[PDB]
Amino acid sequence: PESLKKLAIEIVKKSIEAVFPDRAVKETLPKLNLDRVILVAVGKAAWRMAKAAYEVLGKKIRKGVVVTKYGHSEGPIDDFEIYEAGHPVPDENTIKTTRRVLELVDQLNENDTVLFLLSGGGSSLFELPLEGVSLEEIQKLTSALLKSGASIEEINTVRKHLSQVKGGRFAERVFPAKVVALVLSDVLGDRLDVIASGPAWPDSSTSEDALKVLEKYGIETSESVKRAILQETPKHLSNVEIHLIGNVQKVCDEAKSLAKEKGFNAEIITTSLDCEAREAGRFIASIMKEVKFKDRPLKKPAALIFGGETVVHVKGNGIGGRNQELALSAAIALEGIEGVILCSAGTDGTDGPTDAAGGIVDGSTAKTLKAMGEDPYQYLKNNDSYNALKKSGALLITGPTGTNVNDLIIGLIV
């Protein structure tokens, strides 16, 4: 009873380890046989990904540079240059460090290779406007577009046409050298045209597209900006190889195999979960009830695996997060059923603005709350999932993982 809870926590903890930067790199990079390497690592996981590459390659790296969030770097790595910069918004340090990265990659020859180690936050952490466009203008134009209700693709079209590195321009500067990118994806569906706005990915959108977006949302812009946009972005790239070394699929696969390794009939139901968090908790609960009482779509002992990135339409003023709402909603749906554990987790280690990664619940959780005089629906209505789970000993606390590939959910039935 106690032990099944422990079993699911271990599976969740060990599944996430499969996408820690160190292990993700070491399980991929050696197979690629890289030589004459300039290492460029950008992202919230930049420092650990760089350290792991150094250990694989050593002096085959001729120069290394690291840009990550303030407070994220963990000291020297041989003689690599270690930098930190603005996130979630780019600042003067972003400009400085990006400018330095372009000094490291210009005038390389066909025989050289850039090892591009990429994780979350790269739109903010990797940026240098085109000559005559200001960072402020970029900050302001983005915010104007968001507020006006522009789509992420429309924001992206405009951003790529204001930048020296987005929209494939980075790969274009590395030319004639090769780009081999290792990507640790925090974007659902691992869309490389969106991840960091595709600095080593061709930009299918045009200057015309960018200007039509601004016109569409009535956003006024300088002459400087409009004539910066007229410089078309690379429509094709010949010097790039991309490998996804971490994403939500890898994490689901590892949980599937860890679960099998423990005697469970295990399957992945989906890795593209994106609906409302509380409604997803009920759907998953309904599947668990099918297994429990009808022994399908898996026979007991069963392990159902889910991955994705749910959302919460915030109506109240509580504290919580998507994974904690998904768990709290499920505990309501599973009240009174023996033999069921559900465990949800942000692979961050951080669900909402909290120290918890998610929830760990069963058929007693809701009645533990009722027996204390609390009402589970009221915590959910008020978006106060964190507190409901703390009161019933159902918070999953992992700590920061040093990675982010969205959400893992696991349901066990016996």
Side-chain angles (χ1 to χ4, degrees), residues 1-78 80-91 93-219 221-222 224-240 242-249 251-312 314 316-340 342-389 391-409 411-414:
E2 189 80 306
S3 48
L4 195 68
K5 195 171 144 274
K6 280 166 181 145
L7 200 45
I9 283 160
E10 212 212 337
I11 292 157
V12 171
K13 273 187 181 49
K14 291 277 168 181
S15 297
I16 290 171
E17 286 182 10
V19 297
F20 274 22
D22 193 73
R23 169 153 158 202
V25 169
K26 278 161 174 181
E27 292 185 352
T28 304
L29 180 48
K31 301 185 203 150
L32 309 179
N33 293 348
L34 299 191
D35 286 302
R36 300 183 128 253
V37 178
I38 289 68
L39 173 162
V40 177
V42 168
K44 299 190 227 185
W47 195 94
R48 301 240 106 160
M49 294 185 68
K51 178 170 169 292
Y54 181 57
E55 291 174 5
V56 172
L57 293 170
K59 292 283 137 282
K60 297 167 158 155
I61 293 151
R62 302 184 154 196
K63 233 292 122 271
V65 64
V66 167
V67 189
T68 194
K69 273 178 78 66
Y70 301 129
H72 277 49
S73 72
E74 299 181 57
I77 311 185
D78 191 41
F80 291 5
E81 300 170 34
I82 311 303
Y83 303 131
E84 311 189 340
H87 178 268
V89 176
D91 58 7
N93 289 337
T94 308
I95 290 165
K96 276 148 161 250
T97 58
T98 297
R99 170 173 288 140
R100 173 52 163 177
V101 174
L102 293 176
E103 298 230 54
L104 302 195
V105 298
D106 294 330
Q107 295 101 311
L108 292 185
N109 50 68
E110 331 68 77
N111 224 25
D112 293 313
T113 295
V114 174
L115 170 56
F116 192 38
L117 303 167
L118 189 59
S119 40
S123 297
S124 196
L125 290 163
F126 203 40
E127 186 61 278
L128 173 80
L130 302 158
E131 259 206 321
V133 178
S134 94
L135 192 78
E136 283 49 50
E137 277 171 298
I138 281 159
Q139 287 164 229
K140 287 213 191 175
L141 271 173
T142 303
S143 189
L145 278 171
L146 288 155
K147 287 191 184 62
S148 295
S151 57
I152 179 76
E153 289 82 12
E154 289 170 318
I155 292 173
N156 207 22
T157 288
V158 180
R159 276 305 285 280
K160 292 179 287 178
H161 284 87
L162 294 177
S163 176
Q164 293 191 49
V165 301
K166 316 259 177 82
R169 288 183 153 146
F170 182 55
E172 171 167 57
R173 289 273 215 116
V174 165
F175 200 82
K178 204 200 152 178
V179 170
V180 190
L182 302 199
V183 182
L184 191 23
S185 164
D186 69 345
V187 175
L188 197 67
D190 316 314
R191 284 259 292 190
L192 300 159
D193 57 333
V194 173
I195 288 169
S197 303
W201 193 258
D203 176 13
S204 71
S205 77
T206 72
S207 297
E208 192 185 3
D209 298 320
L211 297 181
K212 293 201 162 300
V213 171
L214 295 173
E215 144 180 288
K216 190 165 148 290
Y217 297 98
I219 294 153
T221 56
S222 52
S224 251
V225 161
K226 292 196 183 69
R227 78 180 276 119
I229 285 166
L230 286 178
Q231 311 192 227
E232 192 53 80
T233 54
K235 295 288 158 275
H236 62 266
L237 302 173
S238 48
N239 69 330
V240 175
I242 299 173
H243 313 267
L244 290 167
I245 72 172
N247 61 10
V248 77
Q249 297 189 28
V251 174
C252 281
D253 276 349
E254 190 72 350
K256 175 165 172 190
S257 103
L258 285 162
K260 286 183 174 169
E261 203 155 302
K262 306 229 159 73
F264 285 105
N265 300 315
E267 191 59 291
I268 295 169
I269 302 305
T270 185
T271 66
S272 51
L273 211 59
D274 69 0
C275 69
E276 180 83 7
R278 72 177 59 180
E279 303 302 335
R282 291 203 83 74
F283 204 121
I284 293 164
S286 302
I287 302 171
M288 296 170 61
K289 303 202 233 149
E290 201 65 18
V291 163
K292 176 70 172 196
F293 299 106
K294 303 283 160 152
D295 231 23
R296 77 222 161 162
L298 294 162
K299 305 191 295 323
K300 301 172 233 61
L304 300 168
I305 295 108
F306 312 83
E309 185 192 37
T310 49
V311 297
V312 186
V314 167
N317 36 22
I319 67 146
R322 61 200 197 248
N323 296 295
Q324 289 161 54
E325 283 205 5
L326 190 157
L328 180 56
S329 176
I332 289 161
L334 306 168
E335 179 169 353
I337 300 170
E338 294 178 7
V340 293
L342 175 151
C343 178
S344 69
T347 56
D348 266 315
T350 306
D351 189 60
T354 71
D355 57 2
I360 179 71
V361 305
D362 69 19
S364 67
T365 302
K367 47 180 86 268
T368 303
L369 285 171
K370 294 170 178 184
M372 295 168 52
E374 301 285 12
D375 174 29
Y377 295 92
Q378 217 59 237
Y379 283 100
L380 202 49
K381 175 182 293 191
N382 203 54
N383 295 115
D384 201 32
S385 33
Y386 183 98
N387 283 341
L389 302 166
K391 281 175 190 297
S392 44
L395 277 178
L396 170 79
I397 309 269
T398 59
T401 59
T403 182
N404 185 27
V405 302
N406 299 122
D407 302 340
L408 173 59
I409 300 93
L412 300 187
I413 312 90
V414 302

